[PDB]
């Protein structure tokens, strides 16, 4: 009934049922967190790969009529895999946006219409091909789909200069609960506000986003400084807490703390000549000099940050991630500096069996210039840095220890991080923060508030009221979707 309704508008070769020969290949292709590549995983009954907006509209209308819910997938980077799976058995279809990957740049306006199914690498390469002096402030990882990324805000190495990806969105085309294709002018100001940081799924299927391409100099500078415990790593991380968020908006210094060492990784929007003087005046303790400097163009810095010197600009078009593993992730936000003595205690947790990495990104600058209520992303002024706890493993048999570590370090970090509410990042999805409760075919406000306030703070109420206007029947839902407030 649902399938026959789809064939009226969507070609059968773009439709995959569980019995289709290409089903397994199409489902598994973008499942990034391998712990979900199991038989226990609740898989969709149907997979739809649209190539036009009318196909998405048809899918929604067909879904309403035949009682089939839709979970949309772009790059599939969802940490908890909510774009391709369900926690409990329920009938659903997946709208896979991967074939809608157009990046159309308006050369004379420096704007771009980017499809949700395009990965960040497609966007980055597209901008580079059109101009050597233009860039865009999105994530580090090349395989992230624009759809889920922008929906949750999205940040990377350019956050201190230009904010989030969503801060630079000027228009968008969304398919709502009624199957209407709406732009900014047509969806209203609340609906447009909601998709710019309010998380994916909840407010409909965003087909494409119009973004503002921003300037970057012809040469940028990258440095990677590794520091062990005996070289003063604990002292350097302590000082960094106040120095990094206060540095000029052209400089971003991120930390990757693993085991016994702390890697200071940076991207400076300028040359080595100007960077050395800046570092010796603001953070001399790091021992940074011109030997650490790697000068290159902006586009060349994109594969350099996660793939090393081996990565090329052409590698950005590869749709397979360089990370092929089972993972558990959690996030925190620090508002007050953590004392040296306590950083010593945090570092002992990194040599514990099953330990992962702590990735720390400094805020301040351009990200902190936007008011807390301007976009649904509330981590602006007052935030010093974001912390991401990441663990990787092999096989479901070695899952017990690294999973326990993430929860263990999180419990320990409680007095040092943000409180009332304990702020978390939506794109760093964590179901341990709570899931929705469904009473009367609708997700409840009270259950949504638990995790909601963590991700969105005071912006949760407006997000819930907006959901009440667009989708009161709660058609677009998952375990962590915005509940309707009437
Ligand atoms: C795996 C991975 C994730 C990363 C990485 N690096 C990041 C970084 O440097 N900065 C960040 O800010 N975030 C980083 N993330 C985290 C997140 O996983 C991503 O930021 C995105 O959430 C992933 O988006 P996408 O790849 O599109 O994932 P999906 O699983 O397809 O979707 C997530 C989510 O949103 C909904 N959704 C998808 N597409 C749409 C559209 N078009 N409209 C509405 N809603 C959409 C899904 O249903 C789901 O709920 C680095 C790595 C390696
Ligand atoms: C691709 O999708 C677009 C958008 O749905 C289709 O164009 C719309 O068609 C409907 C009727 O089906 C009209 O009411 C709208 O006015 C059209 N919108 C615009 C601005 O084009 C388009 O026909 C589809 N193309 C194909 C080949 O299916
Ligand atoms: C520059 O830093 C390097 C660290 O790799 C160090 O070996 C070198 O001595 C420094 N330059 C000076 C001042 O000699």
Describe this structure in words.
The PDB classes it as oxidoreductase. Keywords: FAD binding domain, oxidoreductase. This protein has 486 residues and is α+β, with helices and mostly antiparallel strands. The chain folds into three domains: 1-100, Uridine Diphospho-n-acetylenolpyruvylglucosamine Reductase, domain 2 (2-Layer Sandwich); 101-218 and 297-322 and 421-486, Uridine Diphospho-n-acetylenolpyruvylglucosamine Reductase, domain 3, CATH 3.30.465.10; 219-296 and 323-420, 3-Layer(aba) Sandwich (Vanillyl-alcohol Oxidase, Chain A, domain 3). Helix content is 27%, strand content 21%. It has helices spanning 2-6, 23-28, 53-65, 120-130, 146-151, 159-162, 184-187, 189-194, 233-243, 272-282, 298-307, 340-346, 400-412, 445-456, 460-470, and strands spanning 15-17, 46-48, 69-73, 92-96, 103-106, 111-115, 134-135, 169-175, 181-182, 205-212, 214-215, 220-228, 251-258, 261-268, 294-296, 326-334, 357-362, 385-393, 438-439, 442-443. The strands form five sheets. The chain has a seven-stranded antiparallel beta sheet with strand order 15-12-14-13-17-18-16. Strands 5-6-10-8-9 form a five-stranded antiparallel beta sheet. The longest helix has 13 residues, at 53-65. The chain is globular and about 70 Å long. The two termini are 32 Å apart. 2-acetamido-2-deoxy-beta-D-glucopyranose (NAG) is lined by residues 287, 289, 291. Flavin-adenine dinucleotide binds at residues 32, 71-79, 82-83, 97, 116, 139-141, 144-145, 147-149, 151-152, 154-156, 200-201, 205-206, 321, 323, 427-428, 478.
């Amino acid at each position: 009934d649902f399938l026959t309704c789809l064939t009226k508008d969507i070609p059968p070769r773009q439709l995959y049922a569980k019995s289709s020969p290409a089903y397994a290949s199409v489902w598994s292709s973008t499942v990034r967190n391998i712990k979900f590549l199991s038989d226990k995983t609740v898989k969709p009954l149907y997979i739809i790969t649209p190539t036009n907006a009318s196909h998405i509209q048809a899918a929604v209308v067909c879904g309403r009529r035949h009682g089939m819910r839709i979970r949309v997938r772009s790059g599939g980077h969802d940490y908890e895999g909510l774009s391709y799976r369900s926690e409990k058995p329920e009938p659903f279809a997946v709208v896979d946006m991967n074939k809608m990957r157009a990046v159309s740049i308006d050369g004379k306006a420096a704007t771009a219409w980017v499809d949700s199914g395009a990965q960040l690498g497609d966007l980055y390469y597209g901008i580079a091909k059109a101009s050597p002096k233009l860039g865009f402030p999105a994530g580090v990882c090349t395989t992230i789909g624009v759809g889920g990324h922008f929906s949750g805000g999205g940040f990377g190495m350019l956050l201190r200069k230009y904010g989030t990806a969503a801060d630079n969105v000027i228009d968008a085309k969304v398919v709502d609960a009624q199957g209407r294709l709406l732009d900014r002018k047509a969806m209203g100001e609340d609906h447009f506000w909601a998709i710019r940081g309010g998380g994916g799924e909840s407010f409909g299927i965003v087909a494409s986003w119009q973004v503002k391409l921003l300037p970057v100099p012809p040469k940028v500078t990258v440095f990677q400084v590794h520091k062990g415990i005996k070289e003063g790593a604990i002292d350097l991380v302590t000082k960094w807490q106040t120095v990094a968020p206060a540095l000029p908006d052209d400089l971003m210094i991120r930390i990757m703390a693993m085991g016994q060492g702390a890697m200071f990784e940076a991207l400076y929007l300028g040359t080595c000549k100007d960077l050395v003087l800046l570092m010796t005046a603001r953070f001399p303790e790091l021992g940074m000099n011109a030997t650490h400097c790697k000068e290159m163009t902006w586009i060349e810095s994109v594969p350099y940050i996660p793939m090393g010197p081996k990565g090329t600009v052409r590698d950005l078009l590869n749709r397979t991630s360089n990370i092929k593993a089972f993972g558990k992730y959690k996030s925190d936000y620090v508002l007050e500096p953590i004392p040296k003595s306590d950083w010593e205690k945090i570092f002992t947790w990194l040599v514990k069996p099953g330990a992962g990495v702590m990735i720390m990104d400094p805020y301040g600058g351009g990200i902190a210039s936007v008011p807390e209520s301007a976009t649904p992303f509330p981590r602006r002024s007052g935030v010093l840095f974001n912390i991401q706890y990441v663990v990787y493993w092999f096989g479901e048999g070695a899952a017990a220890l690294p999973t326990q570590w993430t929860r263990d370090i999180y419990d320990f970090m409680t007095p040092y991080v943000s409180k009332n509410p304990r702020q978390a990042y939506v794109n760093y999805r964590d179901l341990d923060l709570g899931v929705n409760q469904v009473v009367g075919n609708v997700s409840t406000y009270a259950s949504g508030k638990v995790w909601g306030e963590k991700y969105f703070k005071g912006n949760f109420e407006r997000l819930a009221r907006t959901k009440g206007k667009i989708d009161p029947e709660d058609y677009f839902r998952n375990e962590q979707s915005i509940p309707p407030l009437l």
